[PDB]
Coordinates of all heavy atoms in Angstrom, one line a residue:
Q20 N 107.5 99.5 79.8 CA 107.5 100.8 80.5 C 106.5 100.7 81.6 O 105.3 100.6 81.3 CB 107.1 101.9 79.5 CG 107.2 103.2 80.3 CD 107.0 104.3 79.3 OE1 106.6 104.1 78.2 NE2 107.1 105.6 79.8
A24 N 108.1 97.9 90.3 CA 107.6 97.1 91.5 C 106.3 96.3 91.2 O 105.9 95.5 91.9 CB 107.4 98.1 92.6
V31 N 113.0 90.9 90.9 CA 113.2 92.2 90.6 C 114.5 92.7 91.2 O 114.8 92.4 92.3 CB 112.0 93.1 91.0 CG1 111.8 93.2 92.4 CG2 112.2 94.5 90.5
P34 N 118.6 98.2 92.8 CA 119.9 98.9 92.9 C 120.0 99.7 94.1 O 119.3 100.6 94.3 CB 119.9 99.8 91.7 CG 118.8 99.5 90.9 CD 117.8 98.9 91.7
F39 N 122.4 98.6 101.8 CA 121.0 98.2 101.3 C 120.1 99.3 101.6 O 118.9 99.2 101.9 CB 120.5 97.0 102.1 CG 121.2 95.7 101.8 CD1 122.5 95.5 102.5 CD2 120.7 94.8 100.9 CE1 123.1 94.3 102.3 CE2 121.4 93.7 100.6 CZ 122.6 93.4 101.3
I41 N 117.3 101.9 100.9 CA 116.2 101.9 100.0 C 115.8 103.3 99.7 O 115.3 104.0 100.6 CB 115.1 101.1 100.7 CG1 115.5 99.7 101.0 CG2 113.8 101.0 99.8 CD1 114.5 99.0 102.0
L49 N 109.7 100.2 95.1 CA 109.5 98.9 95.7 C 109.1 99.1 97.0 O 108.2 98.4 97.5 CB 110.9 98.2 95.7 CG 111.4 97.6 94.4 CD1 112.8 97.2 94.6 CD2 110.5 96.6 93.8
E72 N 129.1 94.2 98.9 CA 130.3 94.6 98.2 C 129.9 95.2 96.9 O 128.8 95.0 96.4 CB 131.3 93.4 98.0 CG 130.9 92.3 97.0 CD 129.9 91.3 97.5 OE1 129.2 91.5 98.6 OE2 129.8 90.2 96.8
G81 N 110.2 88.6 98.1 CA 109.5 89.8 97.6 C 108.2 89.9 98.3 O 107.1 90.2 97.7
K87 N 108.8 87.6 93.3 CA 109.0 86.6 94.3 C 110.2 86.9 95.1 O 110.2 86.7 96.3 CB 109.2 85.3 93.7 CG 108.0 84.7 92.9 CD 108.3 83.4 92.3 CE 107.1 82.9 91.6 NZ 107.6 82.1 90.4
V96 N 129.8 103.1 91.0 CA 129.6 104.5 90.6 C 130.3 104.7 89.4 O 131.4 104.3 89.2 CB 130.0 105.4 91.7 CG1 129.8 106.8 91.3 CG2 129.2 105.1 93.0
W97 N 129.6 105.4 88.4 CA 130.2 105.8 87.2 C 131.4 106.7 87.5 O 131.4 107.7 88.3 CB 129.2 106.7 86.5 CG 129.5 107.3 85.3 CD1 129.4 108.6 85.0 CD2 130.0 106.6 84.1 NE1 129.7 108.8 83.7 CE2 130.1 107.6 83.1 CE3 130.2 105.4 83.9 CZ2 130.5 107.2 81.9 CZ3 130.6 105.0 82.6 CH2 130.8 105.9 81.6
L114 N 122.0 88.0 87.9 CA 121.5 86.9 87.2 C 121.9 85.5 87.8 O 121.1 84.7 87.9 CB 122.1 86.9 85.8 CG 121.7 88.1 84.9 CD1 122.6 88.1 83.6 CD2 120.2 88.0 84.6
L122 N 115.1 80.9 89.1 CA 114.0 81.8 88.7 C 113.9 81.8 87.2 O 114.9 81.7 86.5 CB 114.3 83.1 89.3 CG 114.4 83.2 90.8 CD1 114.5 84.6 91.3 CD2 113.2 82.5 91.4
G136 N 125.1 107.4 88.6 CA 125.5 108.3 87.7 C 125.9 107.8 86.3 O 126.4 108.6 85.5
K148 N 125.2 93.8 77.6 CA 126.5 93.1 77.3 C 126.7 92.0 78.4 O 127.1 90.9 78.1 CB 127.7 94.1 77.4 CG 129.0 93.5 77.1 CD 130.1 94.5 77.0 CE 131.4 93.9 76.8 NZ 132.0 93.1 77.9
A149 N 126.5 92.4 79.6 CA 126.6 91.4 80.8 C 125.6 90.2 80.6 O 125.9 89.1 80.9 CB 126.3 92.2 82.1
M158 N 125.0 77.5 80.8 CA 124.1 76.7 80.1 C 122.9 76.2 81.0 O 121.9 75.9 80.5 CB 124.7 75.5 79.4 CG 125.7 75.9 78.2 SD 125.0 76.9 77.0 CE 125.4 78.5 77.5
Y166 N 113.4 91.3 81.9 CA 112.7 92.5 81.7 C 113.7 93.6 82.0 O 114.3 93.6 82.9 CB 111.5 92.7 82.7 CG 110.5 91.6 82.3 CD1 110.3 90.6 83.3 CD2 109.7 91.6 81.2 CE1 109.3 89.7 83.0 CE2 108.8 90.7 81.0 CZ 108.6 89.7 81.9 OH 107.7 88.8 81.7

Side-chain angles (χ1 to χ4, degrees):
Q20 186 174 5
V31 62
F39 294 82
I41 302 168
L49 289 170
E72 71 277 18
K87 296 180 184 147
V96 175
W97 177 234
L114 299 169
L122 305 183
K148 181 176 178 296
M158 293 306 95
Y166 296 110

